[PDB]
Design a protein around this ligand. Structure first.
Ligand SMILES: O=C(O)c1cccnc1
Length: 334
């Protein structure tokens, strides 16, 4: 009685068949640019894995973003570089422009294209029903692309979606937790950010896949349409699953655990309780009702499922009625 194995329903074997060099990032030899081409202009933020600046290319006065890598294994940096290179040019994928050796930090620095974005804490307050549909669709194009390329993002969240709203321009950023999908691999569950972690991570089911990103995306959609960011606000990873269970219910949670023969951590015992599945209408109120439609709720419901195999894929999600008018709008004659 260990856990039952799982496979991605789509894109299962896309790496199997690639040249080894595509996915074998530990063998990757970095192409270094010239650090003296860039000057830091203003700090944007700083966290566990890097400090991030707006910067300028002083050879041509172009704005860029520089992410100075904190010290980590060479393999971790190679993974992020290789993924960025493999995905470069794909729809809504941030473009890695250069890789340099930062002299002061003694570490590599990644140079990205600049997106003039609006902080999601201000932007989300202003989004219309159409805007949510449009940007959702844009994120789905990036996720279908990366999934189709054999890569899980593993950190989908609002902070990692840059939006230049006047240009209706979106880029999926921060590929530092991303990894290649290989069928049967048991992955590290210490990925994503708490509020966006899928149930698979929270119950310690390691044989997960691209579908993790679809849970995170559902969390983002809930936060948009209901004006509640983040939607599932746990205090820690255990309470995070409790928050989910108070909405999706405990019946379906325990069904999922049974199906995969998961051994549930006993710290859950005193905390998970017994909860009915709630209707999404419980979250509707006068300030969000204009964002909520039957289509939005049907789509959300098909993302936020305990069983990772039963969530929509990105490519299926793009066909949902919620997106009909966005799809029509983007069929441009050129
Ligand atoms: O990928 C990143 O971490 C990144 C990309 C562009 C801008 N800021 C951060």
């Amino acid at each position: 009685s260990g856990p039952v194995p799982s496979r991605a329903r789509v894109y299962t074997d896309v790496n199997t068949h690639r040249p080894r060099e595509y996915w074998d990032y530990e063998s990757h030899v970095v192409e270094w640019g010239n650090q003296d081409d860039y000057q830091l202009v203003r700090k944007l933020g700083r966290g566990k894995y890097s400090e991030v600046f707006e910067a300028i290319n002083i050879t041509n006065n172009e704005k860029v973003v520089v992410k100075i890598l904190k010290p980590v294994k060479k393999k971790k940096i190679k993974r992020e570089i290789k993924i960025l290179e493999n995905l470069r040019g794909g729809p809504n994928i941030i473009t890695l422009a250069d890789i340099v050796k930062d002299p002061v930090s003694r570490t590599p620095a990644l140079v990205f294209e600049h997106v003039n974005n609006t902080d999601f804490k201000q932007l989300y307050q202003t989004l219309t029903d159409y805007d949510i549909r449009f940007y959702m669709y844009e994120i789905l194009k990036a996720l279908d692309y990366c999934h189709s390329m054999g890569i899980m993002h593993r950190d989908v969240k609002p902070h990692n979606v840059m939006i230049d709203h006047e240009h209706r321009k979106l880029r999926l950023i921060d590929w530092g937790l991303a990894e290649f999908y290989h069928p049967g691999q048991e992955y590290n569950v210490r990925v994503a950010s708490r509020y966006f972690k899928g149930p698979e991570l929270l119950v310690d089911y390691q044989m997960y896949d691209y579908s993790l990103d679809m849970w995170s995306l559902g969390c983002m959609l809930a936060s948009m349409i209901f004006r509640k960011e983040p939607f599932f606000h746990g205090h820690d990873n255990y309470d995070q699953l409790v928050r989910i269970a108070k909405v999706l219910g405990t019946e379906d949670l325990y069904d999922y655990i049974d199906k995969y023969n998961i051994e549930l951590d006993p710290r859950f015992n005193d905390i998970l309780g017994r909860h009915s599945r709630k209707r999404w209408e419980r979250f509707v109120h006068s300030e969000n009702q204009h964002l909520v439609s039957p289509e939005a709720l049907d789509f959300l419901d098909k993302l936020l499922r305990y069983d990772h195999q039963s969530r929509l894929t990105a490519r299926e999600a793009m066909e949902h009625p919620y997106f009909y008018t966005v799809v029509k709008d983007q069929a441009r004659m050129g």
